[model samples]
Target: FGTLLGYAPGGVAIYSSDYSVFRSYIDDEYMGHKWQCVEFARRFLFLNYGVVFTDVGMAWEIFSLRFLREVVNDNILPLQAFPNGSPRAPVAGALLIWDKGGEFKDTGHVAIITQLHGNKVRIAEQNVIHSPLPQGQQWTRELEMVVENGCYTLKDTFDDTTILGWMIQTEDTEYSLPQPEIAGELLKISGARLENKGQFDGKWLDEKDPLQNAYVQANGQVINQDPYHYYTITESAEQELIKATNELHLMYLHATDKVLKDDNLLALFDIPKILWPRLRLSWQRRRHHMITGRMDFCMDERGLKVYEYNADSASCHTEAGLILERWAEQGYKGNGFNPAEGLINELAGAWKHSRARPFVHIMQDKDIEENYHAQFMEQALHQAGFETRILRGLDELGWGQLIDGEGRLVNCVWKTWAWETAFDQIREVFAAVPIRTGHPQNEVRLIDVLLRPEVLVFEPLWTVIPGNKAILPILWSLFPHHRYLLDTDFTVNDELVKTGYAVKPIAGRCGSNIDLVSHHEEVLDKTSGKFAEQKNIYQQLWCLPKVDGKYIQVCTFTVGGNYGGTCLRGDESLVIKKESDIEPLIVVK
Candidate 1:
């Protein structure tokens, strides 16, 4: 299966000899599943043009992309998509996409346009030709091109397949289809109930397992009050989740870059000015060192709208990864599976590849929920072969040159506290970082370990840029009206007012200090918390979908900057709080 096929244009090797389901990478860039149509297309663009498209779950999804990323500078270039037959003719080096029907079926197909003649176009692709090409031939197949009255069209040799279009790198908008919006109903969240055969009457979760037991100690043996009642999403919705998670993660990274480069933008996050250089250095050094984070979204008939990205220290990992699995094992007997089935394994793999110290000290607050959350990740750290110790609170931490109570050097840490939690500690101080030093009743603080020059922290210091709601305005400014993004600005604007908007504290967490207003100048909902004085940003008002008498929000975890898993949070209020319960979720074909 690893055997090499013929070479594609630009000397890019086309391996796999078939559709192999393995990953192949050129340095840090993920080349997608090895030897698949999507993988070859990505490698071809990266090798020849030094650019690549964002991740897509299937080859058919490529036709929907509007930009190609420059690997050298991390800059984005506009791309236009034209239908199979349009005034815009197919050009050399463009991408040819296939529709998801007939021969191509569910995933569709992608290929590179090697050379274009007046009557024919040469293409190279993988997972199509099983035999080797001529000794020196680069192109794999050729399709006939026809032009009538200057309208160019291409025909595939396969009688059953349909050619969607060609994508080109340019700013021209003529003859290009608008972004394909999905049917509103496909994006809807549906409710389902597991047949109650007494599966959850008493103890379904095994207390012997530490991860499951820790959950029991906190919530007392249930994912929610009604374990039998759950939610189900269509396979189409799952694919959309994968595409959004991957693309939005990259979009946030792009916005983070834009913010870090300009002082005016960085100033909006309300972070201390003294640590600006530290944040830049972390972005430069640990751009890929992030292990995991979560993005909250409102997915319903209006489509997927992102609320905010908890890029620093997100909550609700254990519930989706471990606790839900325990629920499914007892009652689930369907064709679909939990979307987060591989989350723990994804975390383990990310930890295995990170440049972390062998022993990771997991730091968390004294809260009951935080304890299991810390331990849940600690289990993953151990799975990656790294020794771990769960340290509760900072009382045991001292200035043994920043060491834990056991006297471990504490070189690496994965904490449950947000980086903003540390920023708040030093915002009003005049000192840089304000970390305690020497033996004058040595006190170790959050920034002392996270911002220390010698320590490495997961989520890194720069994540604070995207983690802050201030980045929402920056993103809306860069990609205005993007399908996944809402209209957000530093102040309430005419556009925001016309569409209704929400006043959100840029640095707030747990739906705190949020004021929702309707378009006609009416406040819908407001919540008060510790961030009442924090600077606010206005985002277009988009509330969560109410299902079964509870407001439900879909959350996807990004592990190593990709979609790891998905879960649901339900509450009685419009704004989901930390006390919201996680509804069991299943994805069916």
Candidate 2:
């Protein structure tokens, strides 16, 4: 099925070239789409100039000759040719016939020249939407041969009977127009909110530029209501929200260390919480189709507090028309929120001023634990038009080796996993070997690497960092104010405050080895000199906001450096999970 969708548009030479070039162009950049404009550009450029080039506009002209003809022909009953405008393809491949002035019969569909192969040329194409299937390959070729041998080109007499069923009859019209199921699908998916006021209609159809509007809106109109929805959070519940957020973060951190030898766990700190308020507002005001979906968070005057980022693969879902149908057929509504916006546009705006394409890769657990999420995300990137590959670990990444497609490769790479950890694989921990995928020759030291921290730093280092428990004390000294930290020289003769304190192990995970102690006797004292030799940090514990008398938890997702994919969780037991307990989960972007 994946390959079927991948190569469904395999047509003629010109079509193949145009589509292939589009794919190549998108794969070079991390935009919202992978290779959407490829095929349309092929039919467009080759039809007009008999060749396809890198030009975006010249490639769109094919729509005028082909796609639009179907629209008008279907709109007008008894399809008739327009003068000097509506030219229909003859022999089903490359036939440009000129007829009338304006309206439905004016311009015909332009197909690439596919008949140059032999005595017969057959133009093969699959319309994005609303099209009539062509004749069988053999008959089409025989028809092409007749034209090449001078038996009279099919242009002299193209059959309109195929279009007679879908034409929109009019008092002044005498011709039938093309009726495309693709357009019908678009209308059905859009519901009642298909805007037709923008130019080009998001396709490379070269015409007088129709006013094509957004297929998706900010919050989805009645006609284009988004299928996915979100639940809002309160400011009081912020603490509980961070718990779920941090839990998700820890899973990837552990997963990464399990596979990769890099122990740079401190890198995955609370950037989202630090900047939470801003992200929440952005989620609310965001317009356009978000690939994974829109993120909606909760915040206030203090700062970005808590809430969820749209989960799943975000971006390049701008093709809302397609997504809506799929989601709805699954017994769902509000499916119109699929985002397909261009990453280039958002990043180019004032805030991100990144003149260069960001060095981005799919970050996951080194092994197969997180490969599914990584692979799924990589696949979704096809919409914004990126050909993405998975990097199992930092060692596998070709850091400094520059590959020039859209942006120059730099030392900085983005990771979906957090970087904060205290322990890692003790063996080869400091070996000067090339780690994190890629040949040693291709390894480049990154000056700046961007990571989204899960705040669970110790787990990452336990597998790769030199000492798990030893580094925390150092971090506490350097950066205080972190929550849930207990003192090393504490004399707990008195009752420990319940609301603001928690006991934790430097090498433990989840809620394991955690205790609520009012006095020092309950403290599991392994803080001897030998244990203190490794790096360690004691985090302060804050009470999770309760929801209906239960510890509250919510996991928010941020993707593509853009806040997308938001989900909320409310588990009664301390840990939230897919099954019984909170099991492990992984993410890749």
Candidate 3:
């Protein structure tokens, strides 16, 4: 036998596997083979403590046995064990466990604490220095317990066994102290892949026309299928977005009513003051029938902040209402929700309530992108039981009637062109034709056709109040410190200059004439357009979240003053423009 200063004062040997082990000091049923130290320690627990650890990996991993919450004898236990330096002192039933590394590189050793001798403790183990004796035998060793710096340490006598800590059995091994509840986590899970459906997918017309070519080259689509551009939001996040959207819509309605009543505020929109009476009359008549809108938000962990409200000319109905829902149906099946589901139905319902005449005229500029957008909206209106006719700008519009192929007189009209553009036409007509009579018909213009009592416009002229950038600062003033409102000001003050802001023309389109400034008066991003000459307003900068080197901004649609759906837009630069890629978004439960 190897030189030793002790023997196990209990049972089992260091190497021999002789007879079946007993369960208790005296009981039926075999414990295990009395060979390795792990089996012996397990056997001792079953016999003396009436509890045993489930089979584990190498002896070192026995420390993880604290997860054993059942004792196999109709008794339950907890799993609240600790590692080294714990206040609990070594007791007879505890097991000394070692880590795997250093002296014990393969399977770290385990042994049972037998006795405590004032400063030094005795242990019973197997397979350490000698082979096991036949039956009813054990191995023992004595180790020096040194108290250094008020901490107890067991010095290994063999100089090759490093103890990780002790595995103590207690009445409540799984008990834990109470802790503050942590906030729910935001997890990003894989969504249905948005793989490209292939270029030249017959979605667009032949690229012979410049507008059609631009539409294809710019990746304008009713559906986006670039797998790299998808975001999975939590149910809570979706609910919060709905809440913010509803609250902001209510606030916008109140602000529009306030601005229309106050000429001073209406003048800030840079619209011709001459049309103030017309705008007021339209506002008073159709405030309750505003069809649809889109709220652009800079959403992130920081929170949802509104960038602008696209109340009058919100596009991309095909993407959110048709493409995304189709994507979800094609690729995924789960308990999670799809935001785009039933969105087109919502649009149809909104149109049904718009009081539109039997035949509604859909007017759009001769741009291919605008044509498809008008087509999508036309589909929704058609589903609402309204007969529709498509017209390209004033190309077919005559002085008295919309005479061309059908030679139909236009009455109920919805146009993709901005209201300001129609107003510009009125200004040009009044400036060209002599108006000796003060009657409205004496100055007949293309805009006069829509403003006439016989015709009703879908987006009333009052929409100019909410569509103007000046309304952002107005929203900030009226709903100061509101959750959804960004800090905005009519003029750039020191606060905006120091905190960084975006200077935008009050009537800009497609992200033009926007200057994104840093806190130190540095321009981070800037775009130029014809509207650069218009009056400007300052809004606090809310940076879009950049993923895979592209900045993403979310656009949520509000149909009939309710949250309808959402889509994503991505740009290489901080400013999202007309050419930004429209992506799909999904929700995960």
Candidate 4:
């Protein structure tokens, strides 16, 4: 039942056999069916290191699942995943995953790397070699791995199945991409383009903001006349922004999970403690991975530093994904690319994947800005094959058996209103001290109904963790010295005092309750708001690039866990506010 597939260069012949070889010696082990590939791999792991892998549908799926990373018998082992085409060299005890097409079409094969060489690898596998029914053969194979043009490739001898990647058992989680040196001078130069401006600027803005626009009325005029009011970024900045977005998203996912588990950590975010159960349930579900979120980054000559993640009510989706790109298409006919490309498509795809009901209610306040944002999202959902109805607040909305004009139940909802504002409405309406969860329908408020199990909400309750400024300190603590992260602490530390920092409330909005201090503890810029009473975090100061006496912060948007596009927000002060102008971004080669 065992077969040998040649010897290694070191005169060591690798052989593969049934799991029975190790199972008899290993007590109480589930070796699975005899001579199976998974059985042998599991048996090999148990015998060598006393670790066992969870049952997987296929070999390829094992590398992507989090179950492989779980602890075994109180022993926490490391299982780091690397995607296909990774340059990482193979190591012993690593599981090789094969793509589910070609030779390994039906069910992909998994192999254990017994030994590795500079240009060769010896692997142990079962079920790869065919034998008579009830008596399968195990085989060992030696393949030549060569590095050509800085890319690693494994030569196939028996079958031409594509090798997906390797899952290594290691303690290290720090996986980094190779960075190319970028010239500092490239970022200083500004680029512009002029072409047909008719298609770009039109009635869309007129309707989005009429003369009675509340945003323009509340503040002075926010938008300017220049249709090409934007900045040009180097390709390096784009690459860094993409990487930072991914890293920050992953960190938020991990940190939110951790926060949900810990009562003390969950207390940091100023939300009702009763909602912890619902929040954790949403986090555990994992189906709704933040529909869309924005990362505010300060990218300059120094480097990319994240100010905060606007995970909840991240505005400018219309600007970053649609309006900005439209402007670029009209004016910029040059060789450079628009960072907002594929943003609309990304939104459509996200909506299609989202487990939304037939009819989705896009709820927003009467504010003109929120109305436009809601309509933008509604349009995307409609394009993704969903009937949408825009609701201007909870005025006409009911609690028990809510139905639209067509008698359709309002089940799935996407709100332009932030979770914090919704929670405020709940507090104001219910007037309950403890905020009971499972109460009568009419007894509960609109926000309660949305958060409950019946109705599904976008940017679910768990987003409150990452959306809050408190998450900055949590991210800094979890991923200390991360390239994109700035040093942040719940309480101002000596390091922050020595190297200037921005003190911000945990749940503040629109540059409110912010105190930007210099290295000498002198206040550089301060903003006042109602959030002054909330808990605060001090983050290391990384100023935005000032162009033409205006501060510019690069805002990168992510849809369904992927970088969608980039946009710019300009302000005269260091802290960008509600009135900050949304600018178009051009990516110059």
lDDT of 3 by residue, 355-428 (tens): 67888889887786787678778888989999888887555554443333467767788879787666666556
- Whole-model lDDT per candidate: 0.88, 0.29, 0.67, 0.68
In candidate 3, residue 382 scores what lDDT?
85
Q: RMSD for all candidates, in order, please.
A: 2.1, 23.9, 23.4, 10.5
Which ranking of candidates, highest lDDT first? Answer: 1, 4, 3, 2
lDDT by residue (125-183, candidate 4, tens digit) is 66665432222222267788887665566766655677766777765655512223455
User: Model 4, which residues run further than 4 Å from truth?
Assistant: 1-89, 92-119, 122-169, 172-225, 286-289, 405-407, 425-445
2 or 3, greater by lDDT = 3
Query: Candidate 2 — number of clashing residue pairs?
Result: 139
Q: Model 3, residue 73: what's the lDDT? A: 30
Q: Which has the greatest lDDT?
A: 1
Candidate 2 — which residues are off by over 4 angstroms?
Answer: 1-363, 366-369, 379-385, 391-500, 505-513, 518-541, 545-550, 557-566, 575-589
RMSD, candidate 2, Å: 23.9
* TM-score pick, better of 1 and 4: 1
Which scores better on TM-score, 2 or 4? 4
Clashes in each model (backbone N, CA, C under 3 Å)?
0, 139, 14, 0
